[PDB]
């Protein structure tokens with residue numbers, strides 16, 4: 227379980243910065259013993275970092291991949307098979323968080339999800355996205371990719387893991403940060419901000 231996380235740091239620029247930024251944003255917002263929804267939770271890496279900071283948290287992990295959720299169950303809290311496009315779990319949440327998941331939805335799916343997240347959030351609640359974002363112009367996307375490659379080089383990520391990541395990027399529907407911040411505003415979030423960024427990777431949030 228520590229080996230994967232070590233691999234994730236090799237593959238993701240500023241992994242600690244962007245994940246911690248989300249944890250700290252949540253921690254500054256939510257009441258003690260908060261209820262948290264983790265969308266596209268995977269192995270539960272984001273749910274874990276939040277629990278470490280806020281041990282009394284009630285966390286609900288959602289992911290369409292049973293294989294991923296099994297390992298999450300293994301790391302650990304509720305776990306649920308579900309698609310991001312499906313209705314969110316009921317009951318309301320103090321925070322909704324997501325890491326490297328939402329960029330797989332169509333732009334129409336993202337905007338609809340943003341609205342449904344807003345509706346799931348209790349007053350004062352926060353949505354935080356740790357996200358892969360697109361360069362706004364081709365030269366910027368080339369720079370973003372170059373910077374990603376520089377990280378993978380420096381951290382000596384295994385060749386096959388980088389190749390697999392490259393492959394999975396063919397299923398991406400990334401867009402630039404500014405556009406999706408605007409969509410947050412459009413979805414009825416009171417305040418939106420980018421907390422942290424390292425070229426292609428960014429943590430942003432909206433409050434209801």
Ligand SMILES: C[S@@+](CC[C@H](N)C(=O)[O-])C[C@H]1O[C@@H](n2cnc3c(N)ncnc32)[C@H](O)[C@@H]1O
Pocket residue numbers: 265266267268269270271272288289290291294308309310311324325326327330331
């Ligand atoms: C790159 S992994 C991120 C895992 C975890 N959130 C993290 O930050 O380490 C993307 C995850 O999103 C999930 N996912 C992608 N599209 C999804 C969808 N439409 N509905 C549900 N889960 C989805 C995948 O199953 C996978 O577990």
Ligand SMILES: [Ca+2]
Pocket residue numbers: 326329330394395397398
């Ligand atoms: Ca992806």
